[PDB]
Design a protein around this nucleic acid. Structure first.
Ligand SMILES: [Mg+2]
Ligand SMILES: [Mg+2]
Length: 137
RNA sequence: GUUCGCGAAGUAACCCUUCGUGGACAUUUGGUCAAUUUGAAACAAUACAGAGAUGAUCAGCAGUUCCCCUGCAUAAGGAUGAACCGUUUUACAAAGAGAUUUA
């Protein structure tokens, strides 16, 4: 397959033209947005990946799996702070979803950082959430 | 250049001519733009094919697109105008069983 810069180049251009055709006709079909982001990571170019996710949110934000994978896409490259700000935008966009709060917790427990998880459960309780929040706190 | 006025000289007899001087009349055009190759019409010819739903031969309407063309057109046509017809793994768990390691 690939030889040098120039071949890699053509191999990219072709893919991007193809996909974004297929996204051009379906704004929806989230899976497509995901896969295209995934390819974008495998090219070791993040900036584009960030965007591609963001666009994918501007279409639909209620679709959590995209939130999640746009987290893990930030973590698996071992860049955290992005995966924090993203979390503030996440739970703030959707407080009623547990999966976001729990995932942001685990992100702060595997980092051992407590001060957070204290103030964190302080919020996630302050909204009078439900039985499982208190129980887990 | 005109006209009014003054002064001078000459003609003169308050004028005709010349000179000097004062005043009045008249007042800012045009460029988004330089003169064929290097700041962009689009075709044609040649070659190759030779029309979507089917097992086959065809009528068509649409639908989406950061594609348009002809048309005065919010009419209607342009192969049903064309493109589409492909690639695809994670909100992730529960229970049972054997094996490995260990407080
Ligand atoms: Mg038509
Ligand atoms: Mg059509």
């Amino acid at each position: 397959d690939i030889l040098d810069l120039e071949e890699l180049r053509e191999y990219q251009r072709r893919k991007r033209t193809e996909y974004e055709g297929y996204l051009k006709r379906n704004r929806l079909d989230m899976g497509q947005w995901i896969r295209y982001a995934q390819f974008e990571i495998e090219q070791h170019d993040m900036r584009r990946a960030r965007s591609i996710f963001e666009r994918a949110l501007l279409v639909d934000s209620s679709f959590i799996p995209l939130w999640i994978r746009y987290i893990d896409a930030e973590l698996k490259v071992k860049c955290i702070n992005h995966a924090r700000n993203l979390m503030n935008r996440a739970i703030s966009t959707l407080p009623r979803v547990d999966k976001l709060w729990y995932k942001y917790l685990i992100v702060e427990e595997s980092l051992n950082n407590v001060e957070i998880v204290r103030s964190l459960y302080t919020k996630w309780c302050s909204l009078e959430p439900g039985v499982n929040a208190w129980n887990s706190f």
